Amino acid sequence: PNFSGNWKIIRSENFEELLKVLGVNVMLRKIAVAAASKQAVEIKQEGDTFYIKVSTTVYTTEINFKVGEEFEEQTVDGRPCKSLVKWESENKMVCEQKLLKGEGPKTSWTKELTNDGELILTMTADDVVCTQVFVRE
Numbered sequence: 001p002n003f004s005g006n007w008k009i010i011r012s013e014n015f016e017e018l019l020k021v022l023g024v025n026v027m028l029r030k031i032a033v034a035a036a037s038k039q040a041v042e043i044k045q046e047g048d049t050f051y052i053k054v055s056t057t058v059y060t061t062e063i064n065f066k067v068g069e070e071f072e073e074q075t076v077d078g079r080p081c082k083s084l085v086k087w088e089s090e091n092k093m094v095c096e097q098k099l100l101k102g103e104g105p106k107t108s109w110t111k112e113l114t115n116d117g118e119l120i121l122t123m124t125a126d127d128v129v130c131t132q133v134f135v136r137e
């Protein structure tokens with residue numbers, strides 16, 4: 001099954017609460033929530049190799065990984081981490097993150113392709129889960 005495509009966000013829930021856990025002050029949280037409403041995700045999937053480009057109006061980032069192989073990226077609030085993605089089912093994967101330096105909330109993310117053709121991303125910090133839903137452009 002295939003995540004490849006150009007995805008545009010239709011719903012973003014609990015993102016402010018996630019950023020709050022991660023220590024972001026209120027004005028930056030509000031501006032970040034607004035930036036998230038413009039989020040686009042481009043995915044190229046080849047077997048278990050993924051190329052992902054996530055962008056908003058003024059920023060773009062590339063995430064490249066192979067399932068089961070450690071890689072480096074950043075947490076949501078922007079701290080370098082070591083990440084490891086595993087499948088949880090046919091169309092859902094889970095990424096566990098570990099800070100390269102220092103300490104903080106336990107963070108992770110998941111990506112799921114639903115039977116109805118939506119892409120669901122969750123991002124977690126401790127007890128707080130943000131859910132974002134995308135459809136194909």
Ligand SMILES: *C/C=C(C)/C=C/C=C(C)/C=C/C1=C(C)CCCC1(C)C
Pocket residue numbers: 032035036039041052054055056063075076077109110111121
């Ligand atoms: C498989 C898809 C993944 C791993 C998507 C990750 C997306 C992010 C880490 C998005 C982060 C953003 C911020 C930290 C604030 C600016 C707006 C976002 C939503 C692009």
